[PDB]
Amino acid sequence: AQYEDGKQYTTLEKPVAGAPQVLEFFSFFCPHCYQFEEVLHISDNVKKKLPEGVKMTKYHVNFMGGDLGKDLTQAWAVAMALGVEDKVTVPLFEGVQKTQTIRSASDIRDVFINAGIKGEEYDAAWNSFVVKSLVAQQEKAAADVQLRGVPAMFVNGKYQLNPQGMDTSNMDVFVQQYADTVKYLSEK
Ligand SMILES: O=C(O)Cc1coc2cc(Cc3ccccc3)ccc12
C-alpha cells in the first residue's frame, strides 16, 4: 500500500476511546516543535487539508524542561482558557529557544504582559481551578498514550503520525506528506 503502518504512521496497540479528532502534543522546549510552528506551519497546513470545522486540539507536555516545563504546561492552559494561543505561541518559543530569556514563571508571565494580556487577568487565570483542570486535561491526554516524544499528532485517538518516515530533503514536500497523511488517516 502507498500508506503503510510503520511508514507514514503507526497504530496504537491500545486505542484511546473518545479522543479529539486531531490531537497534537508539543513542548516549547522541543526543537522540532519550534519548526512546526515557525517555518513549517504544520497545524495550519493540516487544517487546510481537512474538512471545514473539524476539531483540532493542541496540548503542551511536561517531560521537557523540568520545573519550567510544568510551568509552561500551566501557561499553555492559561493561553487556552483566555483564547490567546495565537498571541503567545511565537514569543514563548523564541523566549525559550532563541533568546533564552525565559528562565522562570515570572519570565513566562512577561511574555503574556508584553502580548497585551492584563496582569490581573493572567494571574487570575493562572491560579484558577479552570486552569488546574486544563492542566489535568493535557496530562491525561498525553498519559493515554504514554507520550515520550514530541512533536506528536494523533488522529481519532487511533493513529500516530510518523514524520521519521517522511522526506526531509524539502520542507514543503515534508509538510505536504504530513498533511496528506493526516487527511488519509481521517478518512479511514
Ligand atoms: O525526529 C524526526 O526525525 C521526525 C521529525 C519530526 O519533526 C521534524 C522536523 C524536521 C525539520 C525539517 C523538515 C523538512 C525538511 C528539512 C527539515 C525534520 C524531522 C522531523
We report the CATH number of the domain holding residue 83 as: 3.40.30.10
In the reported structure, the alpha carbon of residue 31 is separated from the centroid of ligand 1 by a whole-number distance in angstroms of: 10
C-alpha cell at 111: 511574555
Burial class (CB in 10 A: 0-12, 13-18, 19+), 124: middle
Residue that has been written with the C-alpha cell 503542551 in this structure: 60
Distance 41 CA to ligand 1 centre (A): 12
Cell triple for 122: 493572567
Q: How was this structure determined?
A: X-ray
Q: How far are the Cα atoms of 49, 95, 155, 171 from residue 89, in angstroms, in the given order?
A: 22, 10, 23, 21
Q: Which of 30, 168, 169, when mutated, tests ligand 1's pocket best, judged by the most ligand atoms within 8 Å of its CB?
A: 168
When divided into structural domains, the chain yields a total of: 1
Beta bridge partners of 152: 25
Do the strands 152-155 and 56-60 form a parallel or antiparallel pair, or are they unpaired? unpaired
CB 62 within 8 A of CB 73: yes
**Residue 159: which residues within 8 A CB-CB, separation 6 or more?**
9, 10, 11, 12, 185, 188
Grid coordinates of 145:
498514550
Q: How far apart are CA 149 and CA 114, in angstroms?
A: 30
Helices (H), 28-145: 31-38, 42-49, 66-82, 85-93, 105-114, 119-126, 129-143
Contact between residue 39 and residue 151 where contact means Cβ atoms under 8 Å apart: no
